[PDB]
Ligand binder design. Structure first.
Ligand SMILES: CCCCCCCCCCCCCCCCCC(=O)OC[C@H](COP(=O)([O-])OCC(O)COP(=O)([O-])OC[C@@H](COC(=O)CCCCCCCCCCCCCCCCC)OC(=O)CCCCCCCCCCCCCCCCC)OC(=O)CCCCCCCCCCCCCCCCC
Ligand SMILES: CCCCCCCCCCCCCCCCCC(=O)OC[C@H](COP(=O)([O-])OCC[N+](C)(C)C)OC(=O)CCCCCCCCCCCCCCCCC
Ligand SMILES: NC(=O)C1=CN([C@@H]2O[C@H](COP(=O)(O)OP(=O)(O)OC[C@H]3O[C@@H](n4cnc5c(N)ncnc54)[C@H](OP(=O)(O)O)[C@@H]3O)[C@@H](O)[C@H]2O)C=CC1
Ligand SMILES: CCCCCCCCCCCC(=O)SCCNC(=O)CCNC(=O)[C@H](O)C(C)(C)COP(=O)(O)O
Ligand SMILES: Nc1ncnc2c1ncn2[C@@H]1O[C@H](COP(=O)(O)OP(=O)(O)O)[C@@H](O)[C@H]1O
Ligand code: SF4
Ligand code: SF4
Ligand code: SF4
Lengths: 98, 53, 198, 56, 49, 441, 161, 118, 51, 338, 172
């Protein structure tokens, strides 16, 4: 396989290994690879499998709920968290002895 | 397929293993999305590796 | 301009669905040509450039961006003509320009791409031209261009744990925060900025 | 392309390996000698002398 | 003598004779670096002042 | 010799323990405070047996917003940023900036061209940069005294800088469509000629201890080797490009020459091996050839011949004329050709001419007005093709000014050319790329 | 009293630490070249017994020679803290002193004195090699005198108390 | 031509050569010069505050080049090491004192510089 | 024999994965011939204008 | 006179706080922190000192409190000249005094001088200068005339003299303050590292301690300046809870992971040895005497709650300062990464 | 997988083994991996706010899984608990939850992953990076807080509190 790929096959040629293994650039991706509908990692389709196995399938109900929510709320106000000083709710740091 | 042993070519592509063997999701991901990971997905293999460690 | 020059019309002959807008000026070198290239065709055009016969010996010399939104002709406003390249700056959010040098044709080719979408999306070409990696990283960090399909999106020449695009005209040269040393924390901290006005 | 011309490092003095650089050395020394001869023949050198009365 | 040492010019100060340097009435005597000394530059309004 | 491919490479197979990193690699922070690192490079290095495997360079330790400050300031006040970009080619950086400004203005610096300053001082700066680069490379490899020997010549050249402009470093001398003709002096040219004559001795001293040394040859030869395609893919230029035989020089280009270079008969050198040894030889030869270029430039402004008496057939030397002291007259060609401009320059100033005073006041309050337009002007700086891409909006300030620095592109290839090399080879590669981070950042 | 022995030993200690004054091999910007110029033969540093050491542990002087960026300030603080005592700090160049040409920048610290205590400042941009030599020699003299600057008072017997 | 330490000169009569035209302030690339001027009781156009931040200034020389009356001159002094950062905030007092001390050598250099064009 | 363990799977790796299209992690060491390095004769290719 | 102090605390170092403060005795452990408290809001800070060695980091780092043009260091200060004090506090509306007898000093005369003479002269100078709005003297908790410790014995007289000379003076009585450069946590660590087998105690270790964080002390100083009514009153500052010496040792051992070991030396022999031999930071009679004494907040004067500062508990506050000195026992492989 | 997050980027548990003699495994989720990150490819484009929201949730999950390790290495556990840091970063995300541009969200997620990697690898300083984890309105747990302002201005409007505090130095 190495000789088919073009690696050095002689001791005197071992000194130009980098020119045949690392220097050569990798072919850029085909532009069709940027148009895929979905890029989620592949997983075995657990149709016909037990419910216990299906529990490990990607949760499509969450996607449906998120789609519904974003359809219902195309535009929302920017949340602002009050910076006013407030007494801590967890007072252990200032009220612990040991 | 020439030079690939029992691996045989289908209509839409050539398989990555012998006919009756099981497809590997990790190999599929490496081939399709080589070098790209949007997030560190925790598969069963990753979870089991964490548990073993 | 007493040299032998030819327009790079090969790109537009091959990409038959694009219109050509090209310039040459004595402000540039005799062998330098500017062209307008759409973003949705930029990646395919670079693919063609990187492996066409006469464009095979092409190197990406430079790449950067211009915040054309705030561009205004400060003098000789009336002298502007519809053929000038400045007409494309007005009302366009960003303008990312690349510059290549071709050895077979002894030529310089600059491509201008207009980004009008608010998020500044454009396909990266660092997978075609290796040196474009850091160039695009710098451009993205300094101007906020969202390069897509880029090999490495991590910042280059920007400080740690900070998000900003200083080269935008909105940003002020003095910045927004200064780094001092805090005795209470016994280490360098960053706090709000107060500076000197001449 | 078809008649390559090479520079070969073969002596302690890299100038000696190139006929042009030997001539550069000789021209520099010739210029120095010519300047020295002219100045010696003249016998003196005019110079700018500060004068405080320039600031009246 | 600073310029003479630095080789800016070949003229040197001469006491009691035709000099190459102007001697104005408002000139002050040269002083070495006075930093790290009470007679150091104190900006107006500085806490030391 | 038998094969050693399996002992030389170790691939990684999916979910395989043997074909995997069976060791905890050393993640070292090469720099910033490292003698080999120039001082502002934080390279995360993945060593495995003291052999570099993975590079993660951080180069923001010297980012200063130079382009932002240039945009804020007018044209003239942004020039010294170009001196700061490169610590050893500041003259070339100034030349590129001024070339861009005058390209926007649509004119050329005839005064500088005829006085020959912008070529002789560019070559002197090239000698400066090559001396520093070779000295630092030798210091990294291990040789010590080369730094002192090179820095003596650097001190001489800095003395020339200070004599012409008053600053031994960061000259800020070149300016668009203007020249300080008063500073240019014949005695300065004579001293430069003396320096050129004595520079051969320093070159030979370095050459004797470096060029033929077995250790030096074993350290550099066949290290960092790369083809034209790498030179092309990573935008390698200048010495890095010529070491591949690309034969790419911007000074001897028909459509890209920018000074008196195109009309001087000098030689550029390239190597058939793209390794550190060839790059070192190229730098030495370029240093040597800068002497020839300087000699030609100075001769272009010299009056060699003289009036010969008819009776005696001997020279008639002027006893009380300045031309007897020296044979080099910097203002010779300028006075001969542009007589009216020279007379106006030397007769009218801001203390006696209303127009000159107004021009001076405007020039120093708001910089010269530059017509709106886009330009890209480049020079063959010692570290490669250094360019400025300036967009002007018609005001006294540059709307945008991008700087194409060869140092960034040269540092981009460092992982490629130094992946499989040792740490001792990587410290040589960082020196051979000849990078200063001022222009990188 | 201990002063009888302390004072001559103080003088010896000051002389030794003045004679052997090893700065740290740390340069950030163009000011580095000027430091190298001082180190090299034309203005030999070794004449005054200053030799540069790579590790901070073996350094007596911290030559802040070059611009300091926000991305680097923690590193400078860590280097200063890790340098073994006693030590002094010398800022070199306008950028190291007060931000220099980049005082109005968004990345540059307006002065190394904000992160570190600066013992001495050497103005210049770049400071001349002789300027750096002058600063180092002045720092050495001040260092020699720092041991006993007439703090303790003399009693009726002229012995400090 | 050496640019060392900034100083402010005077006419031979003792009058200040500095007229508050702010050309030097505008040309200063580093914004290191701050000038405020008020009419003098006699009526002269003279500055009331002339500060140069030696830590913020790059010794380029633009100030002396833009000065139309050779008031601000970057004299040859370079041994200006300071132990306190405040000592490098040169004020009008400091600049005038530098000019008074270094006038001889500065004038000697200016003579040659002015005569060169002739 | 110890080396052979990492060699076992290289054949299948190179057979099933494209060495150029697929981004496969690997490590390598660069070798130089010391005899050739010491016997090398320095030389450069001088270039001048056409005559 | 008027004790009002109008200052703006909403700005950073480059702002103008409106406080001009002279801080005597700032070369100690707490001096840099107190100076930085005022400096970080833009206040002008003066540090008069006569410290040996001048090149010490303790003197050097005082310049970082405010910055350039705001922090000044007055060297070679003379503590028996009134003109020196007048110059020091000429332009200061705040005068903080931390000049107290060092733990290294056993001489009663020197301790009394440091804790009384300097404080009285500072108070007299403040009285002379009509622009000194506020004076903040630092006393010690447990100060009493019957106190065996010369330091406390002289500090009681010092605070009395300060009150007599400047009736608008504010006296703080902090408990054992701890921090990175303190004399309590650092001393514990250094003693245990130098012996490697034990900490040498000289008593039953039943003395009560109420540690307070130095950050809390600085916040208390700022709040005291803000509160006009705090003038002319004595404050005792301490942590939320009181621990004995044995309990403090146990807490430190538990936090750091180092097993505890206390080696007992008889109090009488320890006192004789320390009072008859040379004393330095880590070997002094003051530590031996104060081991038995209780240094806690008593109800006789105002407390920290009056200043409206909530001090952090000792276990929480001191944990960060012992991260480096942690026992390395059995740990997980993930924890091995560090 | 040839990525920094790949399952083969784990730190070996032993010099001659990975965690066992019969199995191979390692931890790379709650700690940094073995090899450094040489390249971080851009997030694949998200065509929907659903995909953008999923990316945000996954990034936040990774941040929550890593926070205890970050706190331990940076010695900032005393300042805030792990859950407190998680909630503070949750508030940070909530302030940005109004975004409705998938491209901007992808860019933000890339920046977040980069900063998280910096925190893991100690590229940033603890004092500089704790600004994201700091409470919005609660005191830091390692310091004693001052409630003087609250006592003085109890049951008073924020406008009045700001009016009394001031917004400009009074000296000039
Ligand atoms: C040769 C002629 C022929 C005849 C023979 C003559 C005799 C030959 C003797 C041969 C052996 C000599 C060995 C000593 C060599 C020189 C060094 C030295 O003297 O010690 C100083 C030296 C200083 O410590 P260091 O490690 O260099 O300091 C590092 C940094 O400074 C620390 O940096 P840091 O930041 O960690 O600082 C922490 C803090 C320290 O850390 C702390 O903060 C916690 C501690 C604070 C209080 C410390 C009080 C003193 C503790 C003494 C401990 C002694 C060790 C044994 C303890 C046993 C306990 C069961 O720093 C310090 O204070 C440093 C320690 C200061 C010690 C001051 C007193 C030293 C001189 C007197 C010692 C007497 C010991 C007698 C023991 C019993 C002998 C039978 O080491 C010691 O202190 C231990 C010396 C123990 C041996 C003493 C030998 C002389 C006396 C023997 C008895 C009389 C003679 C009997 C024979 C007579 C025959 C006729
Ligand atoms: C090569 C030179 C070697 C020199 C070694 C010197 C060893 C120590 C000599 C001590 C002489 C003491 C003379 C009598 C003192 C009279 C005062 C008194 O009250 O006595 C009790 C003294 C006083 O200490 P005290 O704390 O009890 O009281 C203080 C004094 N009153 C009360 C008056 C304020 O203490 C002693 O026990 C003796 C002095 C100990 C000094 C310890 C520090 C020594 C520093 C040596 C510096 C030189 C180092 C040389 C090596 C350098 C190497 C690079
Ligand atoms: N655990 C603690 O820190 C506590 C401190 N305090 C009080 O707070 C003050 C500040 O705390 P801390 O930093 O720990 O105290 P320090 O002992 O560290 O500082 C005392 C200061 O007073 C100086 N000084 C000592 N003696 C004299 C003297 N005779 N004449 C002139 N100056 C002298 C010292 O300068 P020099 O370096 O030159 O000797 C030093 O600057 C203490 O002095 C003490 O009064 C109260 C309770 C607990
Ligand atoms: C270790 C230190 C790391 C510090 C990192 C600092 C850098 C962070 C980078 C920026 C991160 C962001 O803001 S990423 C910004 C992401 N954009 C959005 O969240 C808009 C869409 N929002 C939603 O879908 C939901 O609101 C959602 C809140 C997700 C869930 O809410 P629940 O369904 O109701
Ligand atoms: N001092 C001089 N400075 C500049 N150019 C000179 C000078 N002398 C001669 N040239 C040039 O020499 C040429 C005239 O030659 P020649 O008659 O030999 O000189 P000269 O008459 O001054 O002795 C002119 O180009 C003239 O510009
Ligand atoms: S002060 Fe000047 S020479 Fe020194 S680093 Fe800054 S810009 Fe460069
Ligand atoms: S030398 Fe240049 S930067 Fe400095 S004050 Fe003068 S003009 Fe300004
Ligand atoms: S120094 Fe010269 S340029 Fe500056 S204000 Fe005075 S007269 Fe004008």
């Amino acid at each position: 396989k190495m000789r088919d790929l073009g690696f050095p096959m002689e001791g005197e040629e071992e000194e130009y290994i980098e020119q045949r293994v690392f220097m050569r650039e990798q072919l850029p991706p085909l532009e069709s690879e940027f148009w895929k509908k979905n890029y989620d990692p592949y997983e075995q389709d657990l149709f016909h499998f037990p419910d216990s196995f299906k529990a490990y399938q990607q949760q499509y109900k969450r996607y449906d709920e998120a789609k519904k929510y974003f359809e219902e709320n195309p535009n929302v106000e920017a949340t602002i968290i009050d910076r006013e000083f407030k007494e801590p709710t967890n007072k252990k740091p200032w009220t612990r002895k040991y | 397929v020439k030079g690939k042993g029992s691996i045989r070519k289908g209509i839409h592509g050539e398989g990555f293993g012998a006919p009756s063997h099981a497809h590997d999701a990790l190999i599929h991901q490496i081939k399709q999305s080589k070098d790209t990971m949007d997030y560190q997905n925790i598969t069963n293999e990753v979870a089991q590796n964490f548990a073993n460690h | 301009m007493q040299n032998k020059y030819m327009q790079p019309i090969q790109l537009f002959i091959v990409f038959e669905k694009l219109n050509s807008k090209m310039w040459i000026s004595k402000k540039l070198n005799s062998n330098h040509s500017i062209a307008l290239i759409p973003s949705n065709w930029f990646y395919s055009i670079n693919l063609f450039l990187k492996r066409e016969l006469l464009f095979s010996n092409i190197t990406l010399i430079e790449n950067s961006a211009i915040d054309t939104i705030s561009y205004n002709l400060e003098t000789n406003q009336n002298d502007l003509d519809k053929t000038n390249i400045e007409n494309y700056f007005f009302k366009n959010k960003m303008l990312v320009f690349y510059n290549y040098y071709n050895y077979f044709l002894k030529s310089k080719l600059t491509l201008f791409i207009i980004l009008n979408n608010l998020n500044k999306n454009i396909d990266s070409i660092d997978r075609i031209f290796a040196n474009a990696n850091w160039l695009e990283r710098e451009t993205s960090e300094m101007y906020g261009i969202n390069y897509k399909w880029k090999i490495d999106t991590r910042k280059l020449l920007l400080d740690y744990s900070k998000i900003e695009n200083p080269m935008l005209k909105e940003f002020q040269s003095e910045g927004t925060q200064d780094a001092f040393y805090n005795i209470f924390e016994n280490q360098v901290v960053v706090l709000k900025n107060e500076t000197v006005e001449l | 392309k078809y008649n390559p011309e090479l520079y070969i490092y073969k002596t302690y003095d890299m100038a000696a390996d190139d006929p042009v650089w030997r001539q550069v050395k000789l021209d520099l020394e010739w210029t120095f000698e010519n300047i020295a001869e002219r100045r010696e023949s003249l016998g003196y050198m005019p110079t700018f002398k500060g004068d405080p009365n320039f600031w009246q | 003598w600073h310029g003479w040492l630095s080789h800016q010019y070949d003229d040197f100060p001469t006491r009691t004779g035709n000099s190459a340097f102007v001697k104005h009435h408002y000139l002050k005597q040269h002083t070495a670096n006075l930093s790290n000394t009470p007679l150091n530059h104190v900006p107006q309004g500085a806490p030391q002042n | 010799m038998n094969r050693s491919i399996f002992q030389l490479w170790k691939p990684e197979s999916p979910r395989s323990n043997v074909n995997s990193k069976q060791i905890k690699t050393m993640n070292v922070n090469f720099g910033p405070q490292h003698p080999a690192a120039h001082g502002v490079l934080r390279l995360i290095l993945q060593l495995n047996g003291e052999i570099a495997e993975r590079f993660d360079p951080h180069i923001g330790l010297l980012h200063r917003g130079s382009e932002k400050l240039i945009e804020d300031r007018p044209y003239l006040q942004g020039m010294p940023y170009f001196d700061r970009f490169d610590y050893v080619s500041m003259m070339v950086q100034e030349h590129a900036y001024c070339l861009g400004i005058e390209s926007l203005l649509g004119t050329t610096n005839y005064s500088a061209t005829f006085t020959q300053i912008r070529t002789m001082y560019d070559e002197l700066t090239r000698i400066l940069n090559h001396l520093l680069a070779v000295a630092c490379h030798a210091l990294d490899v291990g040789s010590m005294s080369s730094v002192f020997w090179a820095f003596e010549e650097r001190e001489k050249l800095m003395e020339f800088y200070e004599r012409v402009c008053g600053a031994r470093m960061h000259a800020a001398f070149y300016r668009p469509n203007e020249v300080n003709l008063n500073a240019v002096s014949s005695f300065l040219m004579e001293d430069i000629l003396e320096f050129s004559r004595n520079f051969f001795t320093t070159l030979n001293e370095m050459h004797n201890v470096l060029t033929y040394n077995k250790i030096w040859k074993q350290r550099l030869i066949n290290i960092g080797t790369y083809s034209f395609q790498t030179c092309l893919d990573y935008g390698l230029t200048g010495v890095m490009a010529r070491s591949c035989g690309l034969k790419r020089d911007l000074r001897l280009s028909k459509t890209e020459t920018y000074a008196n270079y195109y009309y001087l008969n000098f030689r550029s050198y390239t190597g058939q091996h793209g390794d550190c040894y060839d790059r070192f030889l190229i730098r030495m030869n370029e240093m040597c050839e800068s002497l020839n270029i300087v000699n030609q430039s100075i001769n272009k402004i010299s009056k060699f011949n003289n009036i010969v008496s008819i009776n005696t057939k001997k020279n008639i030397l002027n006893k009380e004329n300045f031309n007897r002291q020296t044979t080099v007259l910097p203002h010779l060609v300028l006075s001969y050709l542009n007589k009216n401009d020279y007379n106006l320059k030397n007769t009218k100033n801001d203390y006696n001419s209303m127009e000159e005073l107004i021009t001076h006041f405007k020039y120093w309050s708001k910089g010269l007005k530059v017509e709106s337009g886009y330009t890209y002007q480049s020079v063959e700086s010692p570290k490669g093709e250094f360019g400025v891409s300036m967009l002007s909006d018609g005001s006294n300030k540059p709307y945008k000014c991008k700087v194409r620095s060869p140092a960034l592109h040269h540092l981009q290839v460092l992982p490629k050319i130094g992946k499989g090399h040792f740490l001792a080879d990587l410290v040589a590669l960082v020196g051979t790329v000849d990078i200063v981070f001022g222009e990188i950042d | 009293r201990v002063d009888y022995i302390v004072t001559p030993i103080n003088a010896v200690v000051s002389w030794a630490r003045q004679g052997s004054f090893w700065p740290l091999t740390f340069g950030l910007a163009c000011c580095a070249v000027e430091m190298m110029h001082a180190t090299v033969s034309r203005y030999d540093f070794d004449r005054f017994g200053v030799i540069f050491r790579a590790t901070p542990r073996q350094a007596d002087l911290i030559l802040v020679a070059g611009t300091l960026t926000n991305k680097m300030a923690p590193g400078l603080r860590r280097l200063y803290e890790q340098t073994l005592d006693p030590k002094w700090v010398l800022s070199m160049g306008s950028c190291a002193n007060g931000g220099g040409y980049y005082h109005y920048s968004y990345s540059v610290v307006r002065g190394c004195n904000r992160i570190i205590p600066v013992d001495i400042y050497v103005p210049g941009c770049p400071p001349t090699a002789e300027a750096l030599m002058f600063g180092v020699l002045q720092l050495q003299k001040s260092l020699y005198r720092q041991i006993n600057e007439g703090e303790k008072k003399y009693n009726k017997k002229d012995l400090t108390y | 031509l050496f640019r060392g330490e900034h100083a402010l000169r005077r006419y031979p009569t003792g009058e200040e050569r500095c007229i508050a035209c702010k050309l030097c302030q505008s040309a200063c690339p580093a914004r290191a010069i701050t000038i405020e001027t008020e009419p003098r009781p006699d009526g002269s156009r003279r500055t009331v505050r002339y500060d140069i931040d030696m830590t913020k200034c790059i010794y380029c020389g633009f100030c002396q080049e833009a000065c139309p009356v050779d008031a601000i001159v970057e004299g040859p002094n370079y041994e200006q090491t300071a132990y306190l950062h405040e000592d490098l905030f040169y004020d009008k007092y400091k600049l005038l004192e530098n000019g008074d001390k270094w006038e001889p050598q500065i004038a000697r250099n200016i003579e040659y510089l002015i005569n060169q064009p002739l | 024999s110890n080396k052979n363990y990492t060699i076992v799977k290289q054949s299948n790796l190179l057979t099933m994965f494209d060495f150029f299209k697929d981004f496969i992690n690997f490590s390598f060491i660069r070798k130089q011939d010391l005899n050739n390095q010491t016997n090398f004769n320095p030389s450069l290719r001088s270039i001048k204008k056409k005559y | 006179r008027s004790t009002q102090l109008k200052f703006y605390d909403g700005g950073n170092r480059q702002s103008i706080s409106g406080i001009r403060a002279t801080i005597f005795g700032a070369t100690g452990f707490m001096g840099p922190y107190i100076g930085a408290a005022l400096g970080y809001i833009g206040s002008d800070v003066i540090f008069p000192h006569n410290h040996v060695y001048a090149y010490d980091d303790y003197v050097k780092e005082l310049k970082l409190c405010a910055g350039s043009g705001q922090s000044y260091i007055m060297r070679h200060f003379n503590y028996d000249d009134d003109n020196m004090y007048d110059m020091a506090i000429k332009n200061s509306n705040v005068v903080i005094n931390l000049v107290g007898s060092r733990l290294q000093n056993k001489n009663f005369q020197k301790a009394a001088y440091a804790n009384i003479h300097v404080a009285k002269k500072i108070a007299e100078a403040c009285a002379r200068n009509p622009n000194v709005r506020r004076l903040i003297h630092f006393s010690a908790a447990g100060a009493d005339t019957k106190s065996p410790s010369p330091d406390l014995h002289t500090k009681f007289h010092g605070e009395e003299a300060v009150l007599n000379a400047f009736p608008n003076a504010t006296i703080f009585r902090p408990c054992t303050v701890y921090g990175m450069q303190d004399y309590f946590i650092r001393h514990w660590i250094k003693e245990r590292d130098w012996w490697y087998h034990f900490n040498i105690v000289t008593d039953d270790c039943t003395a009560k301690r109420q540690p307070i964080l130095i950050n809390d002390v600085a916040q208390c100083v700022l709040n005291a300046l803000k509160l006009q009514e705090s003038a002319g009153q004595i404050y005792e500052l301490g942590g939320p809870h009181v621990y004995s010496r044995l309990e403090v040792f146990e807490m430190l051992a538990n936090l750091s992971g180092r097993p505890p070991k206390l080696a007992h030396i008889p109090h009488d022999i320890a006192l004789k040895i320390t009072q008859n031999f040379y004393n330095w930071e880590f070997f002094n009679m003051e530590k031996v005497i104060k081991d038995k004494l209780d240094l806690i907040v008593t109800g006789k004067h105002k407390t920290i709650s009056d200043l409206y500062v909530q001090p952090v508990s000792f276990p929480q506050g001191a944990e960060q300062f012992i991260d480096d000195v942690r026992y390395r026992g059995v740990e997980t492989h993930d924890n091995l990464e560090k | 997988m040839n990525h920094y997050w790949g399952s083969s980027n784990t730190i070996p548990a032993s010099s001659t083994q990975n965690n066992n003699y019969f199995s191979g495994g390692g931890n790379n989720v709650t700690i940094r991996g073995n090899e450094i990150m040489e390249r971080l490819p851009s997030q694949t484009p998200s065509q929907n706010m659903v995909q953008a929201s999923m990316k945000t949730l996954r990034f936040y999950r990774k941040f929550c899984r890593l926070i205890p390790f970050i706190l331990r290495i940076h010695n900032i556990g005393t300042k805030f608990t792990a859950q407190q840091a998680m909630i503070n970063f949750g508030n940070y995300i909530r302030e940005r939850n109004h975004y409705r541009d998938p491209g901007l969200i992808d860019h933000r997620i890339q920046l977040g992953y980069e900063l998280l990697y910096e925190a893991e690898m100690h590229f940033s300083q603890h004092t500089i990076l704790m600004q994201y984890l700091s409470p919005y309105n609660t005191p830091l747990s390692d310091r004693g807080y001052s409630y003087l302002e609250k006592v003085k201005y109890g049951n008073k409007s924020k406008f009045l509190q700001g009016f009394y505090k001031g917004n400009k130095p009074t000296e000039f």
